[model samples]
Target chain A: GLFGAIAGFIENGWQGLIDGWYGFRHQNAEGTGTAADLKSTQAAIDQINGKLNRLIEKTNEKYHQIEKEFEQVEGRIQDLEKYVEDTKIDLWSYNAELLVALENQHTIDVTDSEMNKLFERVRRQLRENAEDQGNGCFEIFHQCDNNCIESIRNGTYDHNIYRDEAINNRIK
Target chain B: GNPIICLGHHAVENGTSVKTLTDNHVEVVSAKELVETKHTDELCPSPLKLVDGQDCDLINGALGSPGCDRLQDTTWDVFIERPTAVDTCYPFDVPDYQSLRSILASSGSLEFIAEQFTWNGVKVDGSSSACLRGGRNSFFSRLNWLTKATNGNYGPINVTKENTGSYVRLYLWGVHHPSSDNEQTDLYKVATGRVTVSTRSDQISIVPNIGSRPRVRNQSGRISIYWTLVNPGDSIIFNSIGNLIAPRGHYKISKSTKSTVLKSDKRIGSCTSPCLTDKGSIQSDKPFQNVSRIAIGNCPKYVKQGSLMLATGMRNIPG
Candidate 1:
């Protein structure tokens, strides 16, 4: 009975020592693995986020530059339209001035037949008179009388004198 | 006393050599000598002050002088019309007479106005020249009164019934010694002579032949003149009357809805002698239908007259 009791005590001492060794190893492994892994993953994620921020900033700057360029092009188109509209108004004003001058002019109207007939008649009369008067188609006489104006104005120096002068000069 | 002025002229026959009357007395005297003698009191029966620049007054019956004294300072116009060749006395007013004169005087340069004047059955070709002379009265004068009186039957009478004829006429009256001014009015006298039918009256009376006296002796179908002017100026102001005054060159033809237009730089009126329009196309009356296709004519080639070939291409027809 004494031997049996000694054996049981020995078994209990060995079991306690094994349990303390296992608990220490497990604790050490868990603390070291979890801390290291977590720290590395967090650092990688920070780097990727920094790259994304820079890319976004560059994209936004390009969009703003494109918008500024479009505004400049839009401004130029408006100026050309205004110039064409002003030109149309100037041409309309010039046409109005020409209409006023045409109303006050004077002119005579005669037909061709009447004009020719008149010309012919005058020519015939002139020729016949020249023949009947014993004078050529033309005659010349000196009007030395300074009173030609008065003689003509007064009844004294009549058409007969002038005609006689023309014929007489031809005959003399 | 030296003759106041020596005058010379001849007649034209059938558009050829100038014909002279049985009593033709014009001596082809030296133009220089003839030009020397001018107006003198000797030509008249009495000594009277030469009245001029007063045509506006005498016609209004202010007998002594300056009848229309109100118009003495301002220029005035006188228009006399003779309805008959005999005893038609006095002067009457022309429509817008003063206005007509003012318009004429206002032309800073030489210009012309044409109108129509008629008395009895005679229709006068009123032109710038007609204003100076009686309408269709071949007789001309330096003084406007003589012309007005003769035309209006007031002061003078037509010597013969045969003397009155229907025709175009021109009278260059009151010409100054110089083409430019009236300073030598007393010293200068102009007389133009032409065959009323053979040549254009305006040719002899209106256009001044610069240095030489105009000669119409040899022209065919064209009138010439023996002009006498004492100390004529470099330029001669004249009034012309005719359908066309010397078409010196080609004339442009234009067709319009109302009338066919014959355009020329020279004066052109309604189609008169030598101009005939066919199918509304302006043509030469006695010659070629169109001036451009002319082949022969009795008158000068440039003048559209004489025989012309009709479009049928057969024989030539008389113009």
Candidate 2:
């Protein structure tokens, strides 16, 4: 389907590759004869061939990395199911604001119910970074990732549990 | 039966004011200076004449401090009967030792764990003036029913010697005493004082439908507010009123099961807005009756009793 015919001008010299596409590897009666030195030339070609293989491998790795990241982040977003604020990104960042409010509340001696909530809380913050939009609950602007970490620090609410659970389930 | 009083130390729970008596000297350390709980009169006499500006005027004047040979602490099965004053100033026949034992042995509820209490201590200073007068006297520390339950009837028992009411309720009695020390400006006048009750039972319920929040969420300033508000039939297990250490606000905690209520109000255990379970409805479990002890009291520390009458009664309860 790709190749089509377009006859070139009869007298004019050829321009653009053959028919403005691909030209022949060997042309007829062009100048005298320009010989490319093959002493080191084959090696140059061989090196380029190897370089192409490396690029292909790296590209494959990068593509999977992107896909893996999407899945993990997707799981993080799912964790925020019923735990998020009803307000949307248009008006406010309830996620960021909630983190700030929790900070302002000072350290709390949390309960089991309170600790159970941090799992969702951590993921909500993860979603914040995921969206990273102007309206995203920017912990950068609102501040206090550590605030929450500090708030639940003293009580039964182990900040590490929420941290590693939402951050890195594998070893974190 | 008449109300009773005895020899007991004011409970000191954290902060500056700590009251404990060794020998005849009732020491309230941590505050500025100290004053001996030296009543003006001698022992074995009729109740002392009501002093003009005394907290326990009717009894303080009569209960001779050192001479009374007051009853020492006596241990019951599980508790120790300790009263600042014998239940009543009169009843001349019984010795100080015999008097308290008689009351405790007679009133099983009083002997049990339900009647124990701790009062907040107030201090007086020239620059800093405060009073023992607070929202309440004390709250029920424990509520364990002495009688065993039978059928649907919740093993009911009598509270006072008179055995007047079948059930208990938070008692409140507020009477304005203008400037107990306003004359010398040695006291801090409270806004309003009323009657209240509290139980330390955990069987009731908790309402945080607003989602988990920091316990410090409702703090007024830097200190956290003990946001302990209750409905009609609520329960608590830890601290309330006098024993509670929090910013100025309504609070209670400090639990339980099928129990009954007891009564005491008017400063020291000023129950702000307590639960509303009536004795009739409480028949379901007689839960309020589970309370065994109740104490309403506070310790007042005078700056100095000597010639430095200067800072002497600065924050003292001149009432």
Candidate 3:
């Protein structure tokens, strides 16, 4: 009876093996060798995920860095812009002194030679007239060019300082 | 002669060899052509053998019948009988005595029923005499006539693997480089979350990753499948019968730690989403060594987030 039961048990096990054994079959059926790899499907999903994640992280980092750097540059440029307007105001107030000095101060000064020297000083103090005295103020123009254009981009504060105190605000 | 001395299959290598001779009496032999190529390097060749002494071939579609004799005590059939003295055998007490009636009807009034039943002292119940008869054909005849009714319709289960895309896996790994020969690349690489499906039985999980090289230094491995795709994010389902069927269930993208779309299916309208199991990455326990498991039906239906991926399914052959 035990032998019979054993035989019955074996038969049941054999049937189950036959039913699901195909999954273990390789390229050809009814043979031997290891089963084909099924995990590759999952592997493929992982591969694509790796690439996509890299792209996301890298793109975020680059855009954020670019935006922060740009903001700093724009702030400096706006501050320098205000200084340029102040310089224009100082240029107007300084010109009025040269007009008064040319009349009363030159007349009471002295002989023809002394008078000529006084008149010249007044002319120099005034911004030279645009038509005939244009070349007279060339040195001042040269100093302005060097301070504003070349130095302002490097974050130098002197360009703005000139416009606010020495020029527009007339702070001596 | 040994009943099973020689066996042969249609060999495509040696002139479609009709027969092969073996001296080992092994009854089975591996085809050398398949082995030399390292393709399934192993094979089995065994002939279908018979089960009963009644001359029935099992592979030829013969199912046996219960061996019953006339009466209850002994066999009344003349074939299995030995010479007796007075021929005076009577029925004995046995449970299920339907044989008693069959015996009396055949022998008691042999003169009456003999007209239509027995022919030349031999009876036929949709069968001929033992010499000219083969049993079980009658039983098989009652089955679907499509097999015997049509010519060239037997044994059409093609086991040849036509789809190989989902066959093998490749692996890869590395930190930066390794050694003075390489660099400090050991970041302890490992991967999980993936699936594999093959026309044959070669599927894998997303663990240590398969086919990829674990280049802890600078080395790398590649996992190659039987097929490739142009884009990503698509769905593929494999059935047990070697038949790749269309996925009928909708895959709602599930949001996970990653941008994971939950690929699920409903058991509705003759279609069910296969259960998605997490087959951890294909990792070998060894540091530099590797292992790969190749089989089919080891994968669930996969829907890509949005791409055309290679998938294989089988039909006809049950899983």
- Give, for candidate 1 chain B, the lowest lDDT window spanning 10 residues: B243-252
What tens digits encode model 1's per-residue C-alpha lDDT throughout B61-101? 11112223332222211111112212111212233445433
Worst 10 residues of 2 chain B by lDDT: B124-133
Which CAPRI level is candidate 2?
A: incorrect
Ranked by lDDT, top first? 1, 2, 3
For model 1, how does the per-residue alpha-carbon lDDT over A41-150 read when each residue is reduced to its tens digit? 33334343443353343322323311212234445655655555556557656654542232111000111222233323333433312332221111224342435423
Ranking by TM-score: 2, 1, 3
**Interface RMSD for candidate 1 relative to the native interface:** 61.2
In model 3, which regions exceed 4 Å deviation?
A1-146, A157-160, A163-172, B1-319
**Model 1 regions lying over 4 Å from their true place:** A1-172, B1-66, B73-89, B93-99, B103-319
Top candidate on lDDT is 1
Better of 1 and 3 by TM-score: 1
DockQ of 1: 0.00
In TM-score terms, candidate 2 sits at: 0.14
**Model 3: TM-score for chain B:** 0.11
Q: RMSD in Å for candidate 1, one decimal?
A: 53.7
- Listed models, DockQ each: 0.00, 0.00, 0.00
True-contact fraction per candidate equals 0.00, 0.00, 0.00
